[PDB]
Structures are given as C-alpha cells and as structure tokens.
Design a protein around this ligand. Structure first.
Ligand SMILES: NC(=O)C[C@H](N)C(=O)O
Ligand SMILES: NC(=O)C[C@H](N)C(=O)O
Ligand SMILES: [Ca+2]
Ligand SMILES: [Ca+2]
Lengths: 241, 241
C-alpha cells in the first residue's frame, strides 16, 4: 500500500526522533554522571576504609546534588556509608546482595545496572556501580542512583496521529516508560501481544483493531523504543490529506 | 533577487547547523567538566592546605584524563600544585596573576575564562576557574584547562558549497577557529574588513570581490559563528541548477 508505506515512513520519523531524544538527554546525562562517579570512586581509594573520609566526600554539595543518592557498602561487615538524608538501612539490608554491588564485583569496573526497584523510594531506577579496591584487594562497591524521570517526560510529550504513542523497554522487554504508567514493570506483551522484540515493522490485530508497531534499539543502554499506531486511523488521516 | 535570496537562505541553513553543532559538542562537554571541576574543588576544600592530598587527587586517572591539565595556586604563597607532565612553573610564574585565578577570585564562584594563550602549550585554550575556601576565607584558585580542538573540527568539516566557509571568534572579535589556522589569534577584521560583529546579514566589497557574511552568537560562551561566501562564486553555482 502507498498510503500505508507513508504511515510506516512517518512512524519511522518519530521513532528516530525519539531515539535521538533519549541519547541527547538521559544518555548524555549518564555519560557526564559516569565521569563524576569514576573520579569519586578513584579519590576514595586514596583511603577506602576511612569511613569518615567517605562520608565527607559523599556529603559534598555538588556531588550530593547530582544524584538521587550515593553510597559505599563494605565487603567485610556489610555496612553502608551513604548520603540519603531521609533513608537509613533497615537491619535486613545487605549491600552485597544488591544489583549495583553484584555487577560491580563481577565486571571489576564502572557499571550501569538494568532498571530495578529502588529500596529507598520504591521507584524504578538505574544505578552506576563501581568496585572499590585497596591495592587490588576488593573491599566493597558503590552505588550512584539515577532516576528515570526524563524517560517518562519524553514518552508523555509525543502523540502519534492522536492514535498512537511511544514506549520504552529493557532488552528483555520489561516496560520502563509508557503514557499509562500501570504498565511499567510489565513485559510489553501484556498490553501488546503477538509482537516480537526486534527492529523492523510489525503489523498485528488486537481486540478488533489493527496496529502498526516499530522498534528501535538504544545500543548503549540496550533499551528498546516502541512506536505503535492504530493503522485504520492513521490511514484515515493520511488519505484525507 | 531570487538567486541571491537562495544563497542567503543556504548560508543561513549552514550557520544554524553550526550553532546547533557547537552547542551539542563543546557546550555539552563543558557542562560535564564544570560538574567535575566543581566536585574536585569541593573535595579539595576538605583539606585545602594539605598539598600532598591535592596532588594525589589531581593525579587520579579519570580526572587527569578529563582535562588538558589541572592545578592549584595559593594566595599567601603563589606556590602551585599541578598535574602537567610537561611543565613546571618557572621563577616568574605567579598563579595569582593568571586569568583563571583573577576571574575566580573576582566572581567568587566557578567561572569559564575567555580564550587565552596557555603558558605551557602556547595554544589558545579556555580554563574553568574555581575559588578555594577554608573556614570562610580565600586560600587560592584552581584551573581546569580545556582544549578548543572541537572548534577546529567543526570548521574544517564544512564548506559552503565551495564558495566560502565558517569561522569562530570571541566576543571581542579574536578568531579562535578558521579553516586556515594562521588567522587564529588575530582579529577577524584582518582577513575580513568592514564587517561588524553583530547578528544578521552583511554584504561587503574587498579587493574587487563581493562577499556575503552572516553572524550568529552562542550566548552561553558569547562566541560568534561567522559564515562567509564569495558571492560571485555562490551565484554561478546556484543559478546553474
Ligand atoms: N539507597 C538505596 O536503596 C541503594 C540502592 N538504590 C538499592 O536499592 O539497593
Ligand atoms: N599553569 C597552566 O599551564 C594553566 C594555564 N594554561 C595558564 O597559562 O596559567
Ligand atoms: Ca541516611
Ligand atoms: Ca609538572
């Protein structure tokens, strides 16, 4: 179809635009925050076990203001130095079982985690994680919490034909941004069944309607951006003009 | 008329692309470094007079790889702690008389200097400046040197349909990037007389020839981007098609 090849072309335009939106906001924020976390981690290995030192550094204003929260968890006694004014570890918190820590211990360098549920705010976030060494003795790890607010803002700022929207998922298809926020945390197949997670153009039927869907990857985070429109409506709009 | 207006239109399209490019490379990167330089400074205020701590921080890898060079010069003393492996202050060097020191002590907060000639590398650079405070008094200022290589990258990557080119100057009219590097350091009026440093379209005559020039500002640096073409060449190229 020629009107249909135009629908697809337009969906592609918005999708590419949304991919550039993500890279220019979140992705460049992370790259900047990564430099901050890496250097903070290096400065702390000047004297890693000095908790007094560690706390002073994490409470310095700009650093404290660039992240949701920052902390250091120690391998020896599972304690936590952190800068979150309103949160304290409850007796059951073990830094070493948290994903920022596991990843950092495994990869042995700066790491960005997959999205996960924050214990402090119960929001879905990501963290920068770093290993801490004392002469190549691994003595603990750090988290630098980044919130995902900007994705929610991008995903609510765009309309497709008033008959479609964009959404964002992880590499395993867990939704992390969606105009209807109930769907976050869900695999996308819960609201968009019979769709594969892959680049390309897919066409489906759902509850008596016909939808066009296209995905694109954001390789650095391994996220997917989905665009989905009602194809009957979009056809009506393009033929009418 | 029509062909002249199109020339103006094309030159404008390239000027705007160059503005967007400048904000998306060096400006973003600057924002990033400002964050880094601000946290490095606040952490050094944990122990401003401790010279050995200052040195082990500035020699930390990620930080020392983020800037051309970094240093700290003391008010009372004019002594300098720095991480340049290719420079050491001679008997004449007084940090307190350098532009980065001066601006920082003036503004009492983080600053970005105007383009100036680096005492070490002799190239034209900018520095971030930050004041250093201990228990509410000035004990010195810091520098974070940033190269301007990206500007050269930008102006050497485009060529206004082989009839002219783009160039960049400070707010005072000093060329900091030009496809022909020997103009750098000179006022732009030396190669392009009778052109005012203001936004808008100008037409001049110079040594028999006719030139079109558009300037645009990048407000947060107060730099000007200039786009110039030989208007007779541009005419031959556009009327053809
Ligand atoms: N403050 C924290 O909760 C640290 C980290 N975000 C975690 O959930 O384990
Ligand atoms: N000391 C330095 O090299 C910093 C700066 N380039 C200056 O000329 O003062
Ligand atoms: Ca706390
Ligand atoms: Ca030196």
């Amino acid at each position: 179809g020629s009107v249909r090849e135009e629908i697809e072309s337009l969906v592609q335009d918005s999708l590419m635009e949304m991919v550039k939106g993500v890279k220019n906001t979140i992705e460049s924020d992370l790259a900047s925050k990564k430099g901050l976390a890496q250097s903070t981690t290096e400065i702390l290995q000047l004297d890693p076990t000095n908790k007094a030192f560690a706390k002073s550094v994490l409470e310095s204003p700009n650093l404290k203001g660039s992240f949701l929260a920052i902390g250091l968890g120690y391998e020896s006694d599972a304690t936590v130095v952190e800068n979150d004014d309103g949160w304290e570890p409850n007796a059951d918190y073990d830094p070493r079982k948290r994903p920022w820590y596991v990843d950092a211990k495994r990869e042995r360098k700066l790491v960005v985690t997959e999205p996960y549920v924050d214990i402090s705010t119960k929001k879905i976030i990501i963290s920068i994680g770093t290993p801490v060494y004392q002469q190549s003795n691994f003595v603990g790890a750090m988290f630098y919490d980044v919130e995902l607010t900007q994705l929610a803002q991008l995903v609510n700022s765009v309309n497709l034909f008033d008959a479609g929207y964009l959404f964002i998922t992880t590499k395993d298809g867990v939704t992390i941004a969606h105009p209807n926020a109930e769907n976050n945390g869900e695999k996308f197949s819960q609201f968009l069944p019979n769709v594969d997670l892959k680049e390309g153009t897919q066409r489906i039927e759902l509850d008596g309607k016909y939808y066009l869907v296209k995905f694109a990857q954001v390789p650095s985070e391994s996220w997917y951006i989905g665009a989905v429109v009602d194809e009957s409506i979009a056809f009506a709009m393009v033929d009418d003009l």
